Amino acid sequence: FLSSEVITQVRSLLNQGYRIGTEHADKRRFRTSSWQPCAPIQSTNERQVLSELENCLSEHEGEYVRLLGIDTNTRSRVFEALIQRPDG
Questions:
Q1: Which of 4, 58, 71, 78 has the least CB density, counted as fewest CB within 10 Å?
Q2: Which residue pairs form cystines in this protein?
Q3: Domain containing 37: what range?
Q4: Are strands 77-84 and 36-37 parallel, antiparallel or unpaired?
């Protein structure tokens, strides 16, 4: 389930040297913005990153998943996007 849009965003973040992360929220936790981190994607190899992202989506079926770009020098989030949303 990786769209062309999401892949372009991930490749750009990697090209700029940013870390990829994800976080998730079930329907109930989304209502209060109560996100939890997913398993880290400690790779900067695009093929492996994308493979791990697809794993993250399939492991959180029915949940909200937000993709993160992270500046590892400063810990700041430089990018966010909701990449999985339940139907509704």
A1: 4
A2: 38-56
A3: 1-88
A4: unpaired
SS (H, E, C) 13-69: HHHCCCEEEEEEECHHHHHCCCCEECCCCCCCCHHHHHHHHHHHHHHCCCCEEEEEE
Q: Which structural technique was applied?
A: X-ray
CA–CA dist 42, 83 (Å, integer)? 19
Specify the number of domains making up the chain: 1
User: Token pair 């093929």 is at which residue?
Assistant: 47
Tokens representing 26 are: 């079930």
Q: For residues 48 and 43, give the distance between their C-alpha atoms in angstroms, rounded to a whole number.
A: 7
For this entry, resolution in Å reads 1.2
State the Cα–Cα distance between residues 65 and 56, nearest whole angstrom: 8
